[PDB]
Amino acid sequence: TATQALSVNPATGQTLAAMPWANAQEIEHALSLAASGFKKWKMTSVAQRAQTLRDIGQALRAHAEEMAQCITREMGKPIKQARAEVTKSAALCDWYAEHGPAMLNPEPTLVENQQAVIEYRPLGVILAIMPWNFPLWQVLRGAVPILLAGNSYLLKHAPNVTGCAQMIARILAEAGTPAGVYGWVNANNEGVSQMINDPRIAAVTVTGSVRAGAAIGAQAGAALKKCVLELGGSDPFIVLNDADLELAVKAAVAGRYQNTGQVCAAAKRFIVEEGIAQAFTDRFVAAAAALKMGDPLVEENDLGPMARFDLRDELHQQVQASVAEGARLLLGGEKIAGEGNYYAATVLADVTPDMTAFRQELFGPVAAITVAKDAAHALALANDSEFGLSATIFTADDTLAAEMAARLECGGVFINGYSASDARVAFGGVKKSGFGRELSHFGLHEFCNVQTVWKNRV
Amino acid sequence: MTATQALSVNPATGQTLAAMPWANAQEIEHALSLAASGFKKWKMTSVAQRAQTLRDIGQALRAHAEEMAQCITREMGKPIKQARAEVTKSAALCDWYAEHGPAMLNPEPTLVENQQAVIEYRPLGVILAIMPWNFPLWQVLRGAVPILLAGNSYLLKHAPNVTGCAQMIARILAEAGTPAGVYGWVNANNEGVSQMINDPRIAAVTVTGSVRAGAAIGAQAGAALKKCVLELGGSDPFIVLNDADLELAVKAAVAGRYQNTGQVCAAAKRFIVEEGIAQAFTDRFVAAAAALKMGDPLVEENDLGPMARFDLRDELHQQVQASVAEGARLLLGGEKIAGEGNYYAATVLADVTPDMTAFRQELFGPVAAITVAKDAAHALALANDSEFGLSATIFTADDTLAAEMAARLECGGVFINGYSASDARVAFGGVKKSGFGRELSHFGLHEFCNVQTVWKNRV
Amino acid sequence: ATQALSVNPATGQTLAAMPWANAQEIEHALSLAASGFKKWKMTSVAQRAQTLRDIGQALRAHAEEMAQCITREMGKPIKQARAEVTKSAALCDWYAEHGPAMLNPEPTLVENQQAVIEYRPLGVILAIMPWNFPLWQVLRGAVPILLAGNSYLLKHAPNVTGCAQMIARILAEAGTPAGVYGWVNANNEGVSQMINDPRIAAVTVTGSVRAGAAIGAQAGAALKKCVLELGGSDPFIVLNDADLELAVKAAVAGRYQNTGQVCAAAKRFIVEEGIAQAFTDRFVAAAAALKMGDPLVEENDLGPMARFDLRDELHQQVQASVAEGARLLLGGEKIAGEGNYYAATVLADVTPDMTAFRQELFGPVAAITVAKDAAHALALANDSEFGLSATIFTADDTLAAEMAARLECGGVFINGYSASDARVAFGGVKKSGFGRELSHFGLHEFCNVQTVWKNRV
Amino acid sequence: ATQALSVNPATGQTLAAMPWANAQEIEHALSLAASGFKKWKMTSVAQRAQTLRDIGQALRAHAEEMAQCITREMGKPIKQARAEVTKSAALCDWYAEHGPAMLNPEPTLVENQQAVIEYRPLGVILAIMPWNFPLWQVLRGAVPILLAGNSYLLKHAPNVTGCAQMIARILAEAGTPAGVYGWVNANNEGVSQMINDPRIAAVTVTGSVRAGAAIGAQAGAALKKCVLELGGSDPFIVLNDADLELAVKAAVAGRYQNTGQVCAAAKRFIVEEGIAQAFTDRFVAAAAALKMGDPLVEENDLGPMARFDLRDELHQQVQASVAEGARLLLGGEKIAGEGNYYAATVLADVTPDMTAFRQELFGPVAAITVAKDAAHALALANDSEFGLSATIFTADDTLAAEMAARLECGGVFINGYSASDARVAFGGVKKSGFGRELSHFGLHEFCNVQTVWKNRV
Numbered sequence A: 001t002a003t004q005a006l007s008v009n010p011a012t013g014q015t016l017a018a019m020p021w022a023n024a025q026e027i028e029h030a031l032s033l034a035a036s037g038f039k040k041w042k043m044t045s046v047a048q049r050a051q052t053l054r055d056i057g058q059a060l061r062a063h064a065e066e067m068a069q070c071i072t073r074e075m076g077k078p079i080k081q082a083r084a085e086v087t088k089s090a091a092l093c094d095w096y097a098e099h100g101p102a103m104l105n106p107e108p109t110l111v112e113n114q115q116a117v118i119e120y121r122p123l124g125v126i127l128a129i130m131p132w133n134f135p136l137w138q139v140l141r142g143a144v145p146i147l148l149a150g151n152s153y154l155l156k157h158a159p160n161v162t163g164c165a166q167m168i169a170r171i172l173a174e175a176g177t178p179a180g181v182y183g184w185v186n187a188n189n190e191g192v193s194q195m196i197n198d199p200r201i202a203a204v205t206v207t208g209s210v211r212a213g214a215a216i217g218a219q220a221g222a223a224l225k226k227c228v229l230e231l232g233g234s235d236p237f238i239v240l241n242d243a244d245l246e247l248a249v250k251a252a253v254a255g256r257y258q259n260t261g262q263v264c265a266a267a268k269r270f271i272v273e274e275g276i277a278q279a280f281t282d283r284f285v286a287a288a289a290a291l292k293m294g295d296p297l298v299e300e301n302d303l304g305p306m307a308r309f310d311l312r313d314e315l316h317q318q319v320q321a322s323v324a325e326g327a328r329l330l331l332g333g334e335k336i337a338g339e340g341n342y343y344a345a346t347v348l349a350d351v352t353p354d355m356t357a358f359r360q361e362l363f364g365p366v367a368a369i370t371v372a373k374d375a376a377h378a379l380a381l382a383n384d385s386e387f388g389l390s391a392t393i394f395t396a397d398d399t400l401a402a403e404m405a406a407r408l409e410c411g412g413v414f415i416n417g418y419s420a421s422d423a424r425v426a427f428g429g430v431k432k433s434g435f436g437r438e439l440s441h442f443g444l445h446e447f448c449n450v451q452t453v454w455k456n457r458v
Numbered sequence B: 001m002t003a004t005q006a007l008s009v010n011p012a013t014g015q016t017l018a019a020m021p022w023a024n025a026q027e028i029e030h031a032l033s034l035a036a037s038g039f040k041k042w043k044m045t046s047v048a049q050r051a052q053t054l055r056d057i058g059q060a061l062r063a064h065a066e067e068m069a070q071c072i073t074r075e076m077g078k079p080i081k082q083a084r085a086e087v088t089k090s091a092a093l094c095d096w097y098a099e100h101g102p103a104m105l106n107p108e109p110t111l112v113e114n115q116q117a118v119i120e121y122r123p124l125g126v127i128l129a130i131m132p133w134n135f136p137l138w139q140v141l142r143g144a145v146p147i148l149l150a151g152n153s154y155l156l157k158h159a160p161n162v163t164g165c166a167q168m169i170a171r172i173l174a175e176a177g178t179p180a181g182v183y184g185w186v187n188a189n190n191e192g193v194s195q196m197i198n199d200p201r202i203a204a205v206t207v208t209g210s211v212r213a214g215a216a217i218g219a220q221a222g223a224a225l226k227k228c229v230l231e232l233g234g235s236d237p238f239i240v241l242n243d244a245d246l247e248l249a250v251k252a253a254v255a256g257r258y259q260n261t262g263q264v265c266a267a268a269k270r271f272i273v274e275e276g277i278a279q280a281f282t283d284r285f286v287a288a289a290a291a292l293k294m295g296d297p298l299v300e301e302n303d304l305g306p307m308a309r310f311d312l313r314d315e316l317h318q319q320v321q322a323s324v325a326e327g328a329r330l331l332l333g334g335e336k337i338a339g340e341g342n343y344y345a346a347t348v349l350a351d352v353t354p355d356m357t358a359f360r361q362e363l364f365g366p367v368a369a370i371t372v373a374k375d376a377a378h379a380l381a382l383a384n385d386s387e388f389g390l391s392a393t394i395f396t397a398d399d400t401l402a403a404e405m406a407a408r409l410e411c412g413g414v415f416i417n418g419y420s421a422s423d424a425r426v427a428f429g430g431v432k433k434s435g436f437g438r439e440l441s442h443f444g445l446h447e448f449c450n451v452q453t454v455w456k457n458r459v
Numbered sequence C, D: 001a002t003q004a005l006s007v008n009p010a011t012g013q014t015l016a017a018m019p020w021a022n023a024q025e026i027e028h029a030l031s032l033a034a035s036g037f038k039k040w041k042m043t044s045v046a047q048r049a050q051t052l053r054d055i056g057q058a059l060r061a062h063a064e065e066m067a068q069c070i071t072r073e074m075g076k077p078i079k080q081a082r083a084e085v086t087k088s089a090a091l092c093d094w095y096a097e098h099g100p101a102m103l104n105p106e107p108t109l110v111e112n113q114q115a116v117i118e119y120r121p122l123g124v125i126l127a128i129m130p131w132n133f134p135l136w137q138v139l140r141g142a143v144p145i146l147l148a149g150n151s152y153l154l155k156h157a158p159n160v161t162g163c164a165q166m167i168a169r170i171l172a173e174a175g176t177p178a179g180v181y182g183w184v185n186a187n188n189e190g191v192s193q194m195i196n197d198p199r200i201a202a203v204t205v206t207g208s209v210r211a212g213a214a215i216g217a218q219a220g221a222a223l224k225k226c227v228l229e230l231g232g233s234d235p236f237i238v239l240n241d242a243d244l245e246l247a248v249k250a251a252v253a254g255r256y257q258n259t260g261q262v263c264a265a266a267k268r269f270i271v272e273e274g275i276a277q278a279f280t281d282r283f284v285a286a287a288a289a290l291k292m293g294d295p296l297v298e299e300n301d302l303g304p305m306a307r308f309d310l311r312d313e314l315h316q317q318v319q320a321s322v323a324e325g326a327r328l329l330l331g332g333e334k335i336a337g338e339g340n341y342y343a344a345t346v347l348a349d350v351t352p353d354m355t356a357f358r359q360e361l362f363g364p365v366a367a368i369t370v371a372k373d374a375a376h377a378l379a380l381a382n383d384s385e386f387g388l389s390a391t392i393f394t395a396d397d398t399l400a401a402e403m404a405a406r407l408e409c410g411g412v413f414i415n416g417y418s419a420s421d422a423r424v425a426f427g428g429v430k431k432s433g434f435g436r437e438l439s440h441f442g443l444h445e446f447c448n449v450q451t452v453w454k455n456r457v
C-alpha cells in the first residue's frame, strides 16, 4: 500500500507522521532482544514481575494526558474517552499485580500423597498483532497478564497508531521494564509472517478483523503455534416488552455509540419485541440525534470522526446496501462534508436477517433495529449471526433472562445493564468472533505452559 | 490418497483384513447433519444425564473388552496384554469423568461484588476429531469422554488402517445408548476432512498425530477461525544422573522406550546419561532390551509385536541407517526381520550426538538413542535441544535439583524417579512442535467449552 | 456487504445491489459451462470465428447503451467508454480473421509427416476481472479463449455487475451458446469453490497483485494453470535528445487515460537531468489544463475515480510521498462534493525509496524522477517490483534498442504511445504476473498442446 | 530425515548421507545463480549453443560412470541407464542445432516493421526434480532453459544426490559458467525460502501430484510462473481390429520400462471385448517372461524399485485392488530378500471405481479393463484425474484420428510406442499438471515474451 506506516489526524485530514517498515536487521534485532529478555525474565520471581506491573501503572499515570492526547490525535476518539482508556489500562496493571500472583500457584491433583502438581510455566515470546480502536487498552489487556506469567511480549501495532506505539514503549521503558520483555516492531505483513515462522516466537495473540484473524491464525496453525483470536462482533441487544424501557434505551445508545461505534463488543443489532418496538425506536432515535459530534479535543463532544477514511467509505456502502435491500433510514446515513472523517450518527429500522446491516459488522455509528415477534423469535434472531462475542438482554423476567443467556451463542451476556470488558471476568467469543479468552485467570493461563510434575510414579 | 479405500492389513501376517471406500458427499453431509442435530438435543441434557451415559459407555466397553482388545491387536499389531490394558484404562476413564467431571462444570464465582457476575462453561458444538492408529481406542476416548460430558458432539475421523476398530467403537457406544450424532465417525479422505473443517456445523477441531498432520490441519482450523488442540509427536528426554536409583531408572527406561513396540508419543526416546553412570546404565539397558521377547502379538508372552505400518518400518530403518552413517554406534538390532510380517529388531544406538538423526527426529519404533552428558547442566541443555517438547523424565536422588530441572525443562510433563504416562488426574500435552492445548483433568473438559461471562445489573 | 453494490462515483448515489450467488447458482453456472463446453469443443474453428463476428455485431448494435453503463457504474469519461466499446468489437473481428490459422496443426521434424502438434481446447476457463475496463478486460481474454474452443465463466468486479449483466445479454443476443459464455456473482468463497471444482480447467486473473497472489496460490494448489495480468508501475524514460513536445503529449496521455486507472499507465517519469526542468514545466501545464468533471460530458478528460476507498488509498500514497520529501507541483487533494473526484496531481523530486516510486499509483498522480544519464535512467526503470510495460523517448535509435533489451518488462514503446493491441503480446514480469494475452499468445495459453504421433516404432 | 540418504535398492545398503543445505549454502546458491545469470543473459545465442555441444561431449566422455551411478542409486537396469545417457547427450546436440532459430524475433502484423516480438531471458529458474530419470529429467528442462539465457538451479530428489554431484562435475568440466548451472541439497523449508526469494524468477517441477500441488501453490503465491509435469495414469486402448502382436509389444514395453517407474507409462489397458482375452493371455505371458534381478546383469529386464516405502505403497494399492474385486493374474508380491524387488504384476477385471484404475501405479503393475465398444473405450480412457499421454491401437486410421481429437491428454500415440522426444511437445492436462516441455515449448516457457514497438502514434 505504502512504503511507510502513515499517521493522519482523522479530525483534520492532515498528515502527522510516516514511519518506514522494519527492515531485516530490525526484525532480527526485535526477535533477538525478545528472546534474551525472556531468558532472564522467566527466571524472575512473580513478586518482581508484579512490582514491574505496579511501576508500569505508575509511569502510565505520570504521562496520562500526553497518552490520551496521542490516542485522540491519531485515531479520533473523543478526548474524554481517550482519558478513560488510560485510566482503565493503568488500573489493569494494579489489578493483576494484586490478584495475578495467586493464579500462578501450582495446583494440587487427586494423585495420592501429594505426588503430582500442575505448574504454570512461562511459554516464551508472544507475538501480538493489535488494532487501532483502543491503541493502549488492547495492548495492555494482553501484555499485562502475558508479562506476569513470565513471557516476553512483542507488539506489531496498527500502522495508523505508530505514534501511540512509540509512546507506550517509552513509558514501559521508564517504568523499568527490562529490554526485550516488552518491545515492538513496525513490521509489514511479510515481516509478521517471518516472525510467526521464527522459533523464537512461541505463540501469537490477535485482536482485529475476521480477515486478519484468519490470515494470522492460518500461519500460526501451520507453524504449530497457539493463538488467541479476539475478532469482530455483531452483538445482539434484546429488549423485551417488560423491560425498563428508559434504562434499555440508555444502555443501547451507550453500547452502540461508544468510541464512535468502533468497538468489537458494541451493541450492533437491536432486537426489540413487537409491543415495545415503536417506543424503543422513537426514544433511541431521539437520544442518538441529540449526541454531539465534532472536534474530539472538545471534552463535551460525544462522537468524533471515524479513525480511517477508507473504513468510513466501507461503512457508508454498508448503509447504502441496507437501504437498497429495504431498510428504513430513520437518522443520518451520510458522510459529513469537510476535511475530517465524520459520519452522521445513523439509525436503520425494518432490518431483516438477510440484510447487510444484520449480517455484517457495522464498525461505526450505525444502529440496526429489528422487530421480534416474541422472546423465542428474539433469541433465534440473536443467534442468526456468524459472530458471537457478547450480547445484552433487557427484561423484567429474571428466570427467562437466565434461560436465554444459557442459549445465547456468545462469550458474554449482560442482563439489564451495560456490557463492558473488566479484568475480573472472561472476554472473548465464538464462531467468527474467534476463540480463546482474555482477562481474569483466562488471559493469564492462555500463554502458560501448563506442566504436570509427578514424582515417584511407580 | 494412496488408494480409493481405507485399507486394513494385519502387520503380523502382511495380509489384507478389509477395505472401506472413502465417504462420499452424501455420507459427509449425513455425518455433519446428524452431529448437529445430536448436539442440538445433547446440549440441553443435564450434566447428570451425560455422566450416566459415561458410566454406560464404560459398562459396554467392559462387556466387549476381549473383542475390542483383539481388534486393536489384529489391525495394528499391539501385544495383546497391552491391548487389554488399553481397554481397561479407557473404561476406567469413563468412570473417572462420570465421578469427577460434573463439578468441573459448576459456574465460577467472580470478584464482581454481590454475586452479580459468574462464569459459565457452556457447550461449544460439534468437535471434529482426527486420531492416530497407535492407541485406537484410548486416543479416541481420551478426548471424547470429556468433550461429551461438556455437552458437545464428537465426530471422529480415524486413521485409515484402524477402520475395523472405529466401527467397533461406534457399535459399543451405540450399545451404551449414546444418542445418534452425539458420537459418530466418518471415513473421510483428506479432502473430506477439509470440507468438514470449513463447514459451520464444526465448532472446533482436535488432532492427535504427527507434526505434519498437525500443521496441515492446524492451518485449516486457523483459517476457518476454529480453535484446535494439537497433540503431536514427541522425542522425550530421559535423564539419568550419577546419583540415580539405577535399577529403577533402567526398568523405567526399558518400559518407556519399548511399550507398544516403541510407538508412543510420550515414549522415552532420547536417553541422556551423566558420564559417571553412562557405562553402567548402557550395559543394563542393552541387556534388558536384548531380553525382550518379540513375535506374534496374540501370544501373551511376547513383549514386542510387529510395527503397525510397513512404510513406517521403512522410514525407521532409514533413520537408523542415517544415524549409523553419521557415526552412531549400533549396540543392538538395527535390522528389519525377514518374513511376511512387519517386524523390526529391538535396537539401541549409542554415542549419539545432537547433530544426528536419532537425536533430531522422532524415532517412532523400538530404537533407543543414548547420549552422554558431562554433568547435570549439560543434560538439561541436551534435553531442551529439540524441536519437540511433550514429556520428560529425570532420575536423581537430589530432590532439589530434580525440582529445579523440571522448572527449566521445555515440555508439558516431567516425571521424577518414575514412569511417564497419561492419567486422567493430570494435564497431558506439549510445547514447541509437540503442539499446544492440554488434555485430561479439567483441561481436556474446558478446552472445548464456550467460557461465558454472565453479568446482571452492570450499571 | 451481502450484496455486490453499484454506486455512481460521479454522484455518490446507489444504482443497484445484487446478492452473492448461492450454492445452487454456483452449481448451475459450473454445470452449464461444462455442458456448453462439451458441445462447443466439437464445433469447427470457423464456426467459432463466425460467432466472434456475431458478438462484434451485437456489441455494435448496443454500443451507446454499453458505453453509458460503463460510465455510470465506474466513472470513465463517456468519450473513453465509447472508445472501449469500439476497441472491444474490433477485437472480435480481428480474431475472427487472424485467429483460425493460429490453431492449425504444426508439422514437426519427425520423419515422413508422422507427428503433428494439435492445439486442442482445454475446458472451462474461470476469469476473475477488474472494474477499470469492464468490457475490454473481459473480451481481451474471452475472445481468444472462446476461439480456442473453451468455455469462459466470468466472475466480474462487484461494482460493475450492471455491465456484467449487459455483456451477458449482448453475447446471448449474438447467439453464443448457453454456457460457452456465462458469468456468476460469486463472493470470494464461491471463487474458491469453483477453482477447486474439476469442471474448471484453468484460471485467468486481471487485477491487483494481492488478488493475483490469492487466486494464483489456489490455482497452483489445484494443479490448474493461470495467466495473471496484475498491476504495473511503468517507467517512461525521456532522454536529453528526445522530441520533447511529443514526449510530453505521450506522457500526459499515458498517465491520465481512464483517470489514471490503467495497469499499463505511464506512472514513473524518469527524465535525464538536461531536459528534466523543461519536461516538468510542460507536463504540469498540460496536466493542469485537463478538464475534470461530469463524465457524461463528452469534453471532460478526467472523471471521478471508480471507488471511494481507492481514492482514499491514493490520497494516503500522496500524503506519504510528500512526508518522505516529494515536491507537490499540482493537485494532491480530494475535490469537495458528493462525487469521488481527485485532482490531477504531479509529484516531483521523487527518489527510489518513496511511496510514489515503489507502489502502483492507480489514479491521476504522476511521479517525476531525475536521472543523471541513460545508464541511471535504465537502473531506475528496473528498480521496481513491477514489470508490465515501459516507454523510452530518445533520438538515439541504437541506444533505445539496447535499453529495450535490458528493460525488465513485457512491452517497450520507443518514441510513441504505449497501448494494448490484438497484434502484439501483452503482459509482464515480476509482480506484474506472468503469461501473455493477445496475438497468438492469448490464444495458446488456454490450449491443450497435444502431440499426435503415428507409427512410432 | 536430517540427511539426504542414498541406499542401493538392489542391496538395501547405505551408499551415502548428505546434510541439508544450511542458510549460508542456500544464500550462496542463490547469489551465484543471480551473478551467473547477469553475465549469461549477455552472451550470444551462438556461445550458449556451443556450451550445449560441450556439455554433450562431456557426458559422452563420462557416459559409463554416469550410467553406473544412476543404476547404483535407484536400481535401473544398466542398459536403460546407458540409454538415458545417450538420449540426454543427443538432446544437447539437438538444441544446439535447432534451438537458436527459436529465439529469433517474430515479426508482427503491425504495418511497416514497426513492432517485433522478442524472446528475452527471464532469470534464475528453480528446478525440483525426481529420481526416476536422474539425468534425463534434469537436462530435459535445463538444456532449453540455458539456451534461452536463463540460469538453472536444481533441487534433486534426496535419494540421488550422488547423481546430482556427478552431473554438476560434468557440466563444470564442459565449461558451463558458475551459477549458470548449479544445484543445492535443500530441504522443503529451503525450497520455500528460494521460491520466495526475488532472485528466483520461475519454477519447474517434475514429480508427483502432491509435490506439484505444494510447490505450485507457493509459486502462485509468489506471482511466479510454473511448469508442472506430474503423474500419469496413461490409457492404452486396443480395439478389435488392432495389430495384436505389435499392441502386445508396445503394451509390455510401455508398462515395464524402468521397472514401471515412468510418468508416461502405459498404466491402464483398455481392451475391446472381442480382442480382450487374446490380448490378456499374450500380455500375461510376455510379462511372466521378463527377467528380474541385479540391474548390473544385462539379461535382467526389470530391476528393484527405487524406494522401499514406495514398494510398500504399491503393494497396498495392489492389495486394495484385489480387495475391491480385481483379478490377480500374475505377481502381486514383494520378493523376499534385502533388495527392493516387486514381482511383475497383472490385475484384470479392473473397473473404474478401483484403486488400480484411479491412482497412479508407479511400479510393475498392469491394470486391464474390458471395453464393450469404441465409445466405452474412449469414456474409460478419459475417466481419470490424470491426462499425460495415451496410446491407441486400431487398424482404422480415421477412427484413431477421431479418438485422438477426443482424448483428454497432452500426447496420443497411434499404433506405436509412446516416448518423449526433443522434436515434440511433452506434458499433460488435469492433475498431470500444465505447461509443456521440449521442442520450442520448453524453450519459450521460461522466456519474457517482450513486445518492442517503435513510433506508435
Ligand SMILES: NC(=O)c1ccc[n+]([C@@H]2O[C@H](COP(=O)([O-])OP(=O)(O)OC[C@H]3O[C@@H](n4cnc5c(N)ncnc54)[C@H](O)[C@@H]3O)[C@@H](O)[C@H]2O)c1
Pocket (backbone or CB within 6 Å): A129, A130, A131, A132, A133, A138, A156, A157, A158, A159, A188, A189, A190, A192, A193, A207, A208, A209, A210, A211, A212, A213, A215, A216, A229, A230, A231, A232, A233, A263, A264, A265, A361, A363, A389, A428, A433
Ligand atoms: N477483543 C476483541 O474481540 C476485539 C477488540 C477490539 C477490536 N476488535 C476488532 O478489530 C477490528 C477493527 O480493527 P482493525 O481495522 O485494526 O483490524 P485489522 O484486522 O485490519 O488489523 C488488526 C491488526 O492486524 C494487522 N493485520 C491485518 N492483516 C494482516 C496480515 N495479513 N498480516 C499481518 N498483519 C495483519 C493490522 O496491521 C493490525 O495491526 C474490528 O473487527 C473489531 O471488532 C476485536
Ligand SMILES: NC(=O)c1ccc[n+]([C@@H]2O[C@H](COP(=O)([O-])OP(=O)(O)OC[C@H]3O[C@@H](n4cnc5c(N)ncnc54)[C@H](O)[C@@H]3O)[C@@H](O)[C@H]2O)c1
Pocket (backbone or CB within 6 Å): B130, B131, B132, B133, B134, B139, B157, B158, B159, B160, B189, B190, B191, B193, B194, B208, B209, B210, B211, B212, B213, B214, B216, B217, B230, B231, B232, B233, B234, B264, B265, B266, B362, B364, B390, B429, B434
Ligand atoms: N497425545 C499426543 O501428543 C500423541 C498421542 C499419540 C500419538 N501421537 C503422534 O501420532 C503419530 C503417529 O500416528 P499416525 O502415524 O497415525 O500420525 P498421522 O499424522 O500420519 O495421522 C494421524 C491422523 O491424521 C490424519 N491426517 C494426516 N494428514 C492429514 C491431512 N493432511 N488431512 C486430513 N487428515 C490428515 C490421518 O488420516 C490420521 O487419521 C506420532 O507422531 C505420535 O507421537 C501424539
Ligand SMILES: NC(=O)c1ccc[n+]([C@@H]2O[C@H](COP(=O)([O-])OP(=O)(O)OC[C@H]3O[C@@H](n4cnc5c(N)ncnc54)[C@H](O)[C@@H]3O)[C@@H](O)[C@H]2O)c1
Pocket (backbone or CB within 6 Å): C128, C129, C130, C131, C132, C137, C155, C156, C157, C158, C187, C188, C191, C192, C206, C207, C208, C209, C210, C211, C212, C214, C215, C228, C229, C230, C231, C232, C262, C263, C264, C360, C362, C388, C427, C432
Ligand atoms: N492486464 C493487466 O496487467 C491489468 C489490466 C487492467 C487492470 N489491472 C490491475 O487491476 C488492479 C485494479 O483493479 P481491481 O481493484 O478490480 O483489482 P482487485 O484485485 O481488487 O480485483 C480484481 C478482481 O479480483 C477479485 N478478487 C480480489 N481478491 C479476491 C479473492 N481473494 N478471491 C476471489 N476473488 C478476488 C475481485 O472481486 C475482482 O473481480 C490494478 O492493480 C491494475 O493494474 C491489470
Ligand SMILES: NC(=O)c1ccc[n+]([C@@H]2O[C@H](COP(=O)([O-])OP(=O)(O)OC[C@H]3O[C@@H](n4cnc5c(N)ncnc54)[C@H](O)[C@@H]3O)[C@@H](O)[C@H]2O)c1
Pocket (backbone or CB within 6 Å): D128, D129, D130, D131, D132, D137, D155, D156, D157, D158, D187, D188, D191, D192, D206, D207, D208, D209, D210, D211, D212, D214, D215, D228, D229, D230, D231, D232, D262, D263, D264, D360, D362, D388, D427
Ligand atoms: N514429465 C513428467 O510429467 C514426469 C516425469 C517423470 C516422473 N514424473 C512423476 O514423478 C513422480 C515420482 O517421482 P518422485 O517420487 O521423486 O516424486 P516426488 O513428488 O515425491 O518428488 C519430486 C521432487 O519434489 C521434491 N518435493 C516433494 N515435495 C516437496 C515439497 N513439499 N517441497 C519441496 N520439494 C518437494 C522431492 O524432494 C523431489 O525433488 C511420479 O508421479 C511420476 O509420474 C513426472
